[PDB]
Structure formats: structure tokens, C-alpha cells
Amino acid sequence: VECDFSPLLSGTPPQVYNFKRLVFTNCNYNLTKLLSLFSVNDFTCSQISPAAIASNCYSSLILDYFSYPLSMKSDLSVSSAGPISQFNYKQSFSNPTCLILATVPHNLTTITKPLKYSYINKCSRLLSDDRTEVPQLVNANQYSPCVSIVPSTVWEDGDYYRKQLSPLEGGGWLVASGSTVAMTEQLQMGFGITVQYTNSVCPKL
């Protein structure tokens, strides 16, 4: 068959802490055609070349996509140390990866803009007997623990969210903090592609 990229071009892309993930196995992909619809502002690959990402055939392909502002290009990197790589979205270093920052051109008219950009500024777990602030750092290929209390979009830059973790969950509290960035004239999106080397996800023709 052919790997399907339709869900990317339908609906409103989620936020960085709710990144939407697609898994592709046993299909034929054309990555150059997917990036043709967009205006790629950034393309940085680790453990693989930007030209070689769309040429090789892989055992599995993983594509996370989200709404991301270009003004935070410094935070979305493997060598970065901002809140994006701690509480929002982390990529595994054991596989070849690529980060793409693109812009939804006006002619693509089925990628609806969100109200604004948002991200988890902090996500801590306040323990009980130890009165200790244990930061909750997100691991690779998983969601943040605070996504359950942070809404789909942070209402105001600096909001605080709390959840009373039950004694069984460890008592104490789970606290988060939200931040926002102003929406741009054209929607800007971020993609993260992770490739895993029987190779059945091959380029078409």
C-alpha cells in the first residue's frame, strides 16, 4: 500500500505537549511530496542526513506533529535545555531522528489555526512527608504526566494547575504551569521523524 499522511492535512494540529503521533510499517512513502506542501523553515537531522532521510527504507517510521512557534526554535533541539525538552516533548537518542519546522501556506486550507501556542512551563510533583519538589521530566516517546490537568490550550501565560494525587498515587500534589505565545499570520508547525531500521517502509517506485 502507501503510507497515509491525510490526518496531518485535516483538522487543527495539537500543541507540543499533546503531539499527535503516526506509526508507519509496511508501506511506501514519498517524504519529498509531504514537505512540498509546506514552506520548510528548518530541517535538522541527527544520526542521518537530510537528503538521506527520504531515500532509505526503514523497518518503522514515526512522525509526531504539533503546532509550534518559530520564535522558540532554540528550545526545540537535541542540544537544547529549555522547558520544551524537559516537560513537553523529548526524542530518543538511540535512533536516527529529524526535526522539521514548517509553515502552513495559505493555499493549504484544511489545517485550521489554534487560538494560540502553548507549552508546559513546569510540571512538579509535591511529595508529602518529604516536602520535596520533584520535577517530572518527560521521557522519550511518551507524554508528560501533567497533560491530564493542562487543558488543550493555556488560557493565560502563567496559569497554574493542581491535582490532588490520592494517597495510593502517593498523596501529595501534582502541579503544573502554562505559557502562551502569540499566534502568527500563518500557522507554523513542528514535526519530529524517528526512523527504526526486515525493512518494509520503503520509498515508492
Binding site: 519538589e133 501565560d157 502563567g158 493542581r162 502541579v175
Partner: protein, 49 residues
């Protein structure tokens, strides 16, 4: 932002001890929120009595 959250937590704690462990936990959460982000510490001290 922080001030409204702290005020809401204090208002919740006010109707708990009068209605103790939950009050202490809520006050600890409010103190942590105030410390993480001035007048909030003064409000906490005033509510302590």
C-alpha cells in the same frame, strides 16, 4: 495567574479546618506556589493566624 490560584487555594483551605490534614496540605501547596513565583507570603502569614 499565581495570585488568583493562591487566593482560591486559601479560600478552599478556610472552609476545611473550620469544617486539619487537608488544611495543612492546602496551606503547604499555597506556600509552595507563592515561593515558586512578595505580597503572597504576607497574605499566607495573615491567613495563618
Amino acid at each position: 495567574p499565581v495570585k488568583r490560584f493562591v487566593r482560591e487555594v486559601l479560600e478552599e483551605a478556610e472552609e476545611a479546618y473550620e469544617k486539619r490534614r487537608q488544611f495543612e496540605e492546602l496551606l503547604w501547596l499555597a506556600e509552595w506556589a507563592a515561593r515558586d513565583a512578595e505580597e503572597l507570603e504576607e497574605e499566607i502569614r495573615e491567613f495563618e493566624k
